[PDB]
PDB file of C-alpha atoms in Angstrom:
ATOM      1  CA  UNK W   1      47.382 115.112-109.132  1.00  0.00           C
ATOM      2  CA  UNK W   2      49.751 112.482-110.544  1.00  0.00           C
ATOM      3  CA  UNK W   3      50.491 113.641-114.130  1.00  0.00           C
ATOM      4  CA  UNK W   4      49.349 117.235-114.087  1.00  0.00           C
ATOM      5  CA  UNK W   5      51.629 120.251-114.025  1.00  0.00           C
ATOM      6  CA  UNK W   6      55.010 121.129-115.521  1.00  0.00           C
ATOM      7  CA  UNK W   7      57.482 118.772-113.832  1.00  0.00           C
ATOM      8  CA  UNK W   8      60.646 117.171-115.206  1.00  0.00           C
ATOM      9  CA  UNK W   9      60.780 114.469-117.894  1.00  0.00           C
ATOM     10  CA  UNK W  10      63.250 112.033-119.449  1.00  0.00           C
ATOM     11  CA  UNK W  11      64.380 111.153-122.987  1.00  0.00           C
ATOM     12  CA  UNK W  12      62.553 107.797-123.077  1.00  0.00           C
ATOM     13  CA  UNK W  13      59.323 109.619-122.267  1.00  0.00           C
ATOM     14  CA  UNK W  14      59.762 111.905-125.316  1.00  0.00           C
ATOM     15  CA  UNK W  15      59.876 109.159-127.931  1.00  0.00           C
ATOM     16  CA  UNK W  16      57.170 107.273-126.060  1.00  0.00           C
ATOM     17  CA  UNK W  17      54.769 110.189-126.399  1.00  0.00           C
ATOM     18  CA  UNK W  18      55.546 110.714-130.080  1.00  0.00           C
ATOM     19  CA  UNK W  19      54.811 107.031-130.742  1.00  0.00           C
ATOM     20  CA  UNK W  20      51.297 107.321-129.311  1.00  0.00           C
ATOM     21  CA  UNK W  21      50.784 110.529-131.327  1.00  0.00           C
ATOM     22  CA  UNK W  22      51.541 108.850-134.659  1.00  0.00           C
ATOM     23  CA  UNK W  23      49.446 105.783-133.818  1.00  0.00           C
ATOM     24  CA  UNK W  24      46.471 107.864-132.757  1.00  0.00           C
ATOM     25  CA  UNK W  25      46.961 110.229-135.684  1.00  0.00           C
ATOM     26  CA  UNK W  26      46.617 107.598-138.417  1.00  0.00           C
ATOM     27  CA  UNK W  27      43.645 106.285-136.448  1.00  0.00           C
ATOM     28  CA  UNK W  28      41.769 109.416-137.409  1.00  0.00           C
ATOM     29  CA  UNK W  29      42.404 108.985-141.152  1.00  0.00           C
ATOM     30  CA  UNK W  30      42.695 105.203-141.736  1.00  0.00           C
ATOM     31  CA  UNK W  31      40.565 103.912-138.848  1.00  0.00           C
ATOM     32  CA  UNK W  32      42.943 100.994-138.174  1.00  0.00           C
ATOM     33  CA  UNK W  33      46.019 100.493-135.992  1.00  0.00           C
ATOM     34  CA  UNK W  34      47.597  97.507-137.795  1.00  0.00           C
ATOM     35  CA  UNK W  35      50.345  99.866-139.007  1.00  0.00           C
ATOM     36  CA  UNK W  36      52.073  97.316-141.198  1.00  0.00           C
ATOM     37  CA  UNK W  37      54.113 100.250-142.600  1.00  0.00           C
ATOM     38  CA  UNK W  38      54.069 103.812-141.280  1.00  0.00           C
ATOM     39  CA  UNK W  39      53.582 106.239-144.204  1.00  0.00           C
ATOM     40  CA  UNK W  40      53.002 109.243-141.917  1.00  0.00           C
ATOM     41  CA  UNK W  41      56.708 109.363-141.129  1.00  0.00           C
ATOM     42  CA  UNK W  42      57.691 109.288-144.808  1.00  0.00           C
ATOM     43  CA  UNK W  43      55.236 111.963-145.834  1.00  0.00           C
ATOM     44  CA  UNK W  44      56.711 114.107-143.071  1.00  0.00           C
ATOM     45  CA  UNK W  45      60.361 113.461-143.917  1.00  0.00           C
ATOM     46  CA  UNK W  46      59.652 114.319-147.556  1.00  0.00           C
ATOM     47  CA  UNK W  47      58.796 117.863-146.550  1.00  0.00           C
ATOM     48  CA  UNK W  48      62.004 118.094-144.533  1.00  0.00           C
ATOM     49  CA  UNK W  49      63.968 116.968-147.579  1.00  0.00           C
ATOM     50  CA  UNK W  50      62.301 119.653-149.758  1.00  0.00           C
ATOM     51  CA  UNK W  51      63.155 122.551-147.413  1.00  0.00           C
ATOM     52  CA  UNK W  52      66.725 121.333-146.868  1.00  0.00           C
ATOM     53  CA  UNK W  53      67.355 121.271-150.619  1.00  0.00           C
ATOM     54  CA  UNK W  54      66.054 124.839-150.836  1.00  0.00           C
ATOM     55  CA  UNK W  55      68.393 126.008-148.060  1.00  0.00           C
ATOM     56  CA  UNK W  56      71.356 124.269-149.742  1.00  0.00           C
ATOM     57  CA  UNK W  57      70.697 126.026-153.078  1.00  0.00           C
ATOM     58  CA  UNK W  58      70.181 129.336-151.274  1.00  0.00           C
ATOM     59  CA  UNK W  59      73.562 128.937-149.588  1.00  0.00           C
ATOM     60  CA  UNK W  60      75.079 127.776-152.883  1.00  0.00           C
ATOM     61  CA  UNK W  61      74.075 131.093-154.476  1.00  0.00           C
ATOM     62  CA  UNK W  62      75.675 133.137-151.676  1.00  0.00           C
ATOM     63  CA  UNK W  63      78.951 131.290-152.299  1.00  0.00           C
ATOM     64  CA  UNK W  64      78.741 132.284-155.989  1.00  0.00           C
ATOM     65  CA  UNK W  65      78.352 135.961-154.997  1.00  0.00           C
ATOM     66  CA  UNK W  66      81.809 136.042-153.344  1.00  0.00           C
ATOM     67  CA  UNK W  67      83.384 134.142-156.242  1.00  0.00           C
ATOM     68  CA  UNK W  68      82.052 136.630-158.863  1.00  0.00           C
ATOM     69  CA  UNK W  69      80.535 140.012-157.844  1.00  0.00           C
ATOM     70  CA  UNK W  70      78.779 142.741-159.848  1.00  0.00           C
ATOM     71  CA  UNK W  71      81.598 145.308-159.947  1.00  0.00           C
ATOM     72  CA  UNK W  72      83.720 143.206-162.328  1.00  0.00           C
ATOM     73  CA  UNK W  73      82.994 145.106-165.564  1.00  0.00           C
ATOM     74  CA  UNK W  74      84.790 145.422-168.908  1.00  0.00           C
TER      75      UNK W  74
ATOM     76  CA  UNK U   1      85.541 123.222-149.691  1.00  0.00           C
ATOM     77  CA  UNK U   2      83.341 126.294-150.053  1.00  0.00           C
ATOM     78  CA  UNK U   3      84.964 128.011-147.072  1.00  0.00           C
ATOM     79  CA  UNK U   4      88.416 127.305-148.575  1.00  0.00           C
ATOM     80  CA  UNK U   5      87.497 128.318-152.141  1.00  0.00           C
ATOM     81  CA  UNK U   6      85.943 131.594-150.937  1.00  0.00           C
ATOM     82  CA  UNK U   7      89.340 132.779-149.612  1.00  0.00           C
ATOM     83  CA  UNK U   8      91.124 132.365-152.990  1.00  0.00           C
ATOM     84  CA  UNK U   9      88.684 134.526-154.940  1.00  0.00           C
ATOM     85  CA  UNK U  10      89.313 137.310-152.389  1.00  0.00           C
ATOM     86  CA  UNK U  11      93.040 137.132-153.242  1.00  0.00           C
ATOM     87  CA  UNK U  12      94.451 136.476-149.780  1.00  0.00           C
ATOM     88  CA  UNK U  13      95.799 133.112-151.087  1.00  0.00           C
ATOM     89  CA  UNK U  14      96.997 132.396-147.539  1.00  0.00           C
ATOM     90  CA  UNK U  15      96.936 128.637-148.276  1.00  0.00           C
ATOM     91  CA  UNK U  16      99.828 126.511-149.513  1.00  0.00           C
ATOM     92  CA  UNK U  17     102.466 124.917-147.287  1.00  0.00           C
ATOM     93  CA  UNK U  18     102.172 125.877-143.606  1.00  0.00           C
ATOM     94  CA  UNK U  19      98.562 127.039-143.950  1.00  0.00           C
ATOM     95  CA  UNK U  20      97.227 124.054-145.943  1.00  0.00           C
ATOM     96  CA  UNK U  21      98.231 121.580-143.158  1.00  0.00           C
ATOM     97  CA  UNK U  22      95.124 122.580-141.105  1.00  0.00           C
ATOM     98  CA  UNK U  23      92.329 121.687-143.579  1.00  0.00           C
ATOM     99  CA  UNK U  24      94.427 118.677-144.551  1.00  0.00           C
ATOM    100  CA  UNK U  25      94.514 117.302-140.998  1.00  0.00           C
ATOM    101  CA  UNK U  26      90.960 118.590-140.386  1.00  0.00           C
ATOM    102  CA  UNK U  27      89.551 116.630-143.346  1.00  0.00           C
ATOM    103  CA  UNK U  28      90.741 113.335-141.781  1.00  0.00           C
ATOM    104  CA  UNK U  29      88.779 114.057-138.595  1.00  0.00           C
ATOM    105  CA  UNK U  30      85.425 114.365-140.361  1.00  0.00           C
ATOM    106  CA  UNK U  31      85.993 111.099-142.255  1.00  0.00           C
ATOM    107  CA  UNK U  32      87.029 109.412-138.984  1.00  0.00           C
ATOM    108  CA  UNK U  33      83.818 110.531-137.233  1.00  0.00           C
ATOM    109  CA  UNK U  34      81.600 108.946-139.946  1.00  0.00           C
ATOM    110  CA  UNK U  35      83.428 105.598-140.251  1.00  0.00           C
ATOM    111  CA  UNK U  36      83.110 105.003-136.499  1.00  0.00           C
ATOM    112  CA  UNK U  37      79.364 104.411-136.994  1.00  0.00           C
ATOM    113  CA  UNK U  38      80.029 101.517-139.462  1.00  0.00           C
ATOM    114  CA  UNK U  39      81.462  98.838-137.071  1.00  0.00           C
ATOM    115  CA  UNK U  40      78.094  97.823-135.511  1.00  0.00           C
ATOM    116  CA  UNK U  41      78.120  94.023-135.983  1.00  0.00           C
ATOM    117  CA  UNK U  42      79.009  90.617-137.515  1.00  0.00           C
ATOM    118  CA  UNK U  43      75.993  89.188-139.391  1.00  0.00           C
ATOM    119  CA  UNK U  44      74.718  89.127-142.957  1.00  0.00           C
ATOM    120  CA  UNK U  45      71.300  89.378-144.637  1.00  0.00           C
ATOM    121  CA  UNK U  46      72.417  90.625-148.075  1.00  0.00           C
ATOM    122  CA  UNK U  47      70.001  90.169-151.013  1.00  0.00           C
ATOM    123  CA  UNK U  48      72.308  87.586-152.686  1.00  0.00           C
ATOM    124  CA  UNK U  49      72.090  85.229-149.687  1.00  0.00           C
ATOM    125  CA  UNK U  50      68.351  85.528-149.177  1.00  0.00           C
TER     126      UNK U  50
ATOM    127  CA  UNK E   1     105.474 109.705-158.003  1.00  0.00           C
ATOM    128  CA  UNK E   2     106.435 109.476-161.665  1.00  0.00           C
ATOM    129  CA  UNK E   3     103.095 110.911-162.821  1.00  0.00           C
ATOM    130  CA  UNK E   4     103.644 113.981-160.597  1.00  0.00           C
ATOM    131  CA  UNK E   5     107.365 114.386-161.386  1.00  0.00           C
ATOM    132  CA  UNK E   6     106.753 114.393-165.169  1.00  0.00           C
ATOM    133  CA  UNK E   7     104.642 117.589-164.817  1.00  0.00           C
ATOM    134  CA  UNK E   8     107.459 119.507-163.042  1.00  0.00           C
ATOM    135  CA  UNK E   9     109.882 118.895-165.913  1.00  0.00           C
ATOM    136  CA  UNK E  10     107.310 120.624-168.169  1.00  0.00           C
ATOM    137  CA  UNK E  11     107.344 123.732-165.910  1.00  0.00           C
ATOM    138  CA  UNK E  12     103.576 124.023-165.421  1.00  0.00           C
ATOM    139  CA  UNK E  13     104.111 123.654-161.648  1.00  0.00           C
ATOM    140  CA  UNK E  14     100.311 123.356-161.284  1.00  0.00           C
ATOM    141  CA  UNK E  15     100.827 121.653-157.901  1.00  0.00           C
ATOM    142  CA  UNK E  16     101.055 123.484-154.581  1.00  0.00           C
ATOM    143  CA  UNK E  17      98.013 124.389-152.509  1.00  0.00           C
ATOM    144  CA  UNK E  18      94.890 123.805-154.673  1.00  0.00           C
ATOM    145  CA  UNK E  19      96.572 121.231-156.933  1.00  0.00           C
ATOM    146  CA  UNK E  20      98.591 119.288-154.337  1.00  0.00           C
ATOM    147  CA  UNK E  21      95.493 118.360-152.305  1.00  0.00           C
ATOM    148  CA  UNK E  22      94.586 115.807-155.014  1.00  0.00           C
ATOM    149  CA  UNK E  23      97.830 113.763-155.028  1.00  0.00           C
ATOM    150  CA  UNK E  24      98.103 114.346-151.275  1.00  0.00           C
ATOM    151  CA  UNK E  25      94.625 112.937-150.540  1.00  0.00           C
ATOM    152  CA  UNK E  26      94.920 110.344-153.341  1.00  0.00           C
ATOM    153  CA  UNK E  27      98.051 108.855-151.729  1.00  0.00           C
ATOM    154  CA  UNK E  28      96.096 107.987-148.561  1.00  0.00           C
ATOM    155  CA  UNK E  29      93.494 106.007-150.515  1.00  0.00           C
ATOM    156  CA  UNK E  30      96.134 103.574-151.841  1.00  0.00           C
ATOM    157  CA  UNK E  31      97.591 102.863-148.376  1.00  0.00           C
ATOM    158  CA  UNK E  32      94.066 102.356-146.998  1.00  0.00           C
ATOM    159  CA  UNK E  33      93.408  99.471-149.428  1.00  0.00           C
ATOM    160  CA  UNK E  34      96.555  97.513-148.517  1.00  0.00           C
ATOM    161  CA  UNK E  35      95.562  97.746-144.826  1.00  0.00           C
ATOM    162  CA  UNK E  36      92.258  96.077-145.709  1.00  0.00           C
ATOM    163  CA  UNK E  37      94.398  93.724-147.795  1.00  0.00           C
ATOM    164  CA  UNK E  38      96.310  92.426-144.745  1.00  0.00           C
ATOM    165  CA  UNK E  39      93.062  91.505-142.918  1.00  0.00           C
ATOM    166  CA  UNK E  40      92.714  88.829-140.203  1.00  0.00           C
ATOM    167  CA  UNK E  41      95.186  87.544-137.636  1.00  0.00           C
ATOM    168  CA  UNK E  42      95.370  86.375-133.999  1.00  0.00           C
ATOM    169  CA  UNK E  43      96.402  82.793-134.828  1.00  0.00           C
ATOM    170  CA  UNK E  44      99.610  83.432-132.805  1.00  0.00           C
ATOM    171  CA  UNK E  45     102.290  81.171-134.331  1.00  0.00           C
ATOM    172  CA  UNK E  46     105.909  82.304-134.508  1.00  0.00           C
ATOM    173  CA  UNK E  47     109.515  81.134-134.773  1.00  0.00           C
ATOM    174  CA  UNK E  48     110.347  82.140-131.161  1.00  0.00           C
ATOM    175  CA  UNK E  49     107.294  80.238-129.891  1.00  0.00           C
ATOM    176  CA  UNK E  50     108.066  77.027-131.774  1.00  0.00           C
TER     177      UNK E  50
ATOM    178  CA  UNK P   1      77.481  62.306-173.968  1.00  0.00           C
ATOM    179  CA  UNK P   2      77.906  64.342-170.805  1.00  0.00           C
ATOM    180  CA  UNK P   3      80.838  66.667-170.344  1.00  0.00           C
ATOM    181  CA  UNK P   4      81.162  67.314-174.045  1.00  0.00           C
ATOM    182  CA  UNK P   5      80.780  70.694-175.769  1.00  0.00           C
ATOM    183  CA  UNK P   6      80.930  74.344-174.751  1.00  0.00           C
ATOM    184  CA  UNK P   7      78.647  74.392-171.693  1.00  0.00           C
ATOM    185  CA  UNK P   8      78.685  76.816-168.742  1.00  0.00           C
ATOM    186  CA  UNK P   9      81.258  76.775-165.911  1.00  0.00           C
ATOM    187  CA  UNK P  10      82.150  78.163-162.461  1.00  0.00           C
ATOM    188  CA  UNK P  11      85.200  79.602-160.662  1.00  0.00           C
ATOM    189  CA  UNK P  12      85.620  76.514-158.447  1.00  0.00           C
ATOM    190  CA  UNK P  13      85.841  74.408-161.587  1.00  0.00           C
ATOM    191  CA  UNK P  14      88.665  76.571-163.006  1.00  0.00           C
ATOM    192  CA  UNK P  15      90.935  75.867-160.025  1.00  0.00           C
ATOM    193  CA  UNK P  16      89.885  72.221-159.964  1.00  0.00           C
ATOM    194  CA  UNK P  17      91.178  71.761-163.491  1.00  0.00           C
ATOM    195  CA  UNK P  18      94.445  73.504-162.662  1.00  0.00           C
ATOM    196  CA  UNK P  19      94.926  71.209-159.690  1.00  0.00           C
ATOM    197  CA  UNK P  20      94.626  68.096-161.874  1.00  0.00           C
ATOM    198  CA  UNK P  21      96.811  69.718-164.571  1.00  0.00           C
ATOM    199  CA  UNK P  22      99.728  70.307-162.184  1.00  0.00           C
ATOM    200  CA  UNK P  23      99.469  66.843-160.592  1.00  0.00           C
ATOM    201  CA  UNK P  24      99.547  65.117-163.979  1.00  0.00           C
ATOM    202  CA  UNK P  25     102.318  67.388-165.239  1.00  0.00           C
ATOM    203  CA  UNK P  26     104.430  66.318-162.248  1.00  0.00           C
ATOM    204  CA  UNK P  27     103.807  62.602-162.876  1.00  0.00           C
ATOM    205  CA  UNK P  28     105.360  62.774-166.352  1.00  0.00           C
ATOM    206  CA  UNK P  29     108.733  64.128-165.220  1.00  0.00           C
ATOM    207  CA  UNK P  30     109.152  62.687-161.699  1.00  0.00           C
ATOM    208  CA  UNK P  31     107.041  59.510-161.994  1.00  0.00           C
ATOM    209  CA  UNK P  32     105.668  59.975-158.482  1.00  0.00           C
ATOM    210  CA  UNK P  33     102.737  61.960-157.113  1.00  0.00           C
ATOM    211  CA  UNK P  34     103.585  62.596-153.464  1.00  0.00           C
ATOM    212  CA  UNK P  35     103.879  66.375-154.064  1.00  0.00           C
ATOM    213  CA  UNK P  36     105.160  67.222-150.586  1.00  0.00           C
ATOM    214  CA  UNK P  37     106.534  70.374-152.246  1.00  0.00           C
ATOM    215  CA  UNK P  38     105.096  71.795-155.424  1.00  0.00           C
ATOM    216  CA  UNK P  39     108.036  73.022-157.509  1.00  0.00           C
ATOM    217  CA  UNK P  40     106.134  73.708-160.715  1.00  0.00           C
ATOM    218  CA  UNK P  41     104.471  76.733-159.146  1.00  0.00           C
ATOM    219  CA  UNK P  42     107.762  78.296-158.000  1.00  0.00           C
ATOM    220  CA  UNK P  43     109.591  77.706-161.274  1.00  0.00           C
ATOM    221  CA  UNK P  44     106.711  79.358-163.099  1.00  0.00           C
ATOM    222  CA  UNK P  45     106.523  82.260-160.689  1.00  0.00           C
ATOM    223  CA  UNK P  46     110.237  82.859-161.220  1.00  0.00           C
ATOM    224  CA  UNK P  47     109.592  83.499-164.902  1.00  0.00           C
ATOM    225  CA  UNK P  48     106.734  85.897-164.188  1.00  0.00           C
ATOM    226  CA  UNK P  49     108.997  87.816-161.846  1.00  0.00           C
ATOM    227  CA  UNK P  50     111.606  87.992-164.567  1.00  0.00           C
ATOM    228  CA  UNK P  51     109.170  89.443-167.110  1.00  0.00           C
ATOM    229  CA  UNK P  52     107.802  91.973-164.625  1.00  0.00           C
ATOM    230  CA  UNK P  53     111.268  93.313-163.714  1.00  0.00           C
ATOM    231  CA  UNK P  54     112.121  93.965-167.371  1.00  0.00           C
ATOM    232  CA  UNK P  55     108.993  96.054-167.907  1.00  0.00           C
ATOM    233  CA  UNK P  56     109.655  98.059-164.723  1.00  0.00           C
ATOM    234  CA  UNK P  57     113.131  99.075-165.921  1.00  0.00           C
ATOM    235  CA  UNK P  58     111.716  99.839-169.391  1.00  0.00           C
ATOM    236  CA  UNK P  59     109.189 102.345-168.018  1.00  0.00           C
ATOM    237  CA  UNK P  60     112.010 103.901-166.015  1.00  0.00           C
ATOM    238  CA  UNK P  61     113.644 104.705-169.333  1.00  0.00           C
ATOM    239  CA  UNK P  62     110.398 106.251-170.565  1.00  0.00           C
ATOM    240  CA  UNK P  63     110.250 108.350-167.385  1.00  0.00           C
ATOM    241  CA  UNK P  64     113.725 109.834-167.952  1.00  0.00           C
ATOM    242  CA  UNK P  65     112.861 110.546-171.613  1.00  0.00           C
ATOM    243  CA  UNK P  66     110.474 113.296-170.519  1.00  0.00           C
ATOM    244  CA  UNK P  67     112.640 114.576-167.641  1.00  0.00           C
ATOM    245  CA  UNK P  68     115.870 115.140-169.660  1.00  0.00           C
ATOM    246  CA  UNK P  69     115.335 114.879-173.431  1.00  0.00           C
ATOM    247  CA  UNK P  70     117.826 115.023-176.262  1.00  0.00           C
ATOM    248  CA  UNK P  71     116.038 117.906-178.091  1.00  0.00           C
ATOM    249  CA  UNK P  72     117.555 120.579-175.776  1.00  0.00           C
ATOM    250  CA  UNK P  73     120.384 121.600-178.124  1.00  0.00           C
ATOM    251  CA  UNK P  74     121.999 124.989-178.881  1.00  0.00           C
TER     252      UNK P  74
END
């Protein structure tokens, strides 16, 4: 076959595939390809922003632990 | 800044003078890496002109 | 320079390491504006050329 | 009529007025308008420089006041 298997690929092919995936994905929910604006991207990025903020706070707390531990009594 | 601050609370206080020159010179490099992305063109489409 | 020097006469000597990074970094910001201030060039006129 | 009263104005108008003000000021003392060189500007600037230098020395005095005061007796 021509496209079967597990052969090599290039960077331009990676974005190209993801473009068809978004376009066919919204086609299942909105039934139109006009795609004036692409809200799927934004809804996805918003999740990424949420998790990143959580990791930043988590790391911010660890920094506080070294600045002021539990054994400092009296 | 967090990496630097963490050392002072531990009491090593290795910074000041000789030691401080590293983060000082290091800080310039990060700023230099970001500004390089800014020089992309010579055109304007600012809200005031539209 | 005067703003910094006035603190030393008081004996607080708050500068060095942690404190000095502020005036140290702050000094660069002033020089960076004058560079942007001298913008343009390449007209190429000069006394030796005339 | 037009031009009278406290209407609005722009930055290009502020310099325009100063240009006419200098040109007429020159005509009263030199009776000619060629203005190959514009000496009013320089003579004015010389005064501004004078005032600035006085203030700079004055602050220098204030600077020394904190560095080596008179209250350090006994």
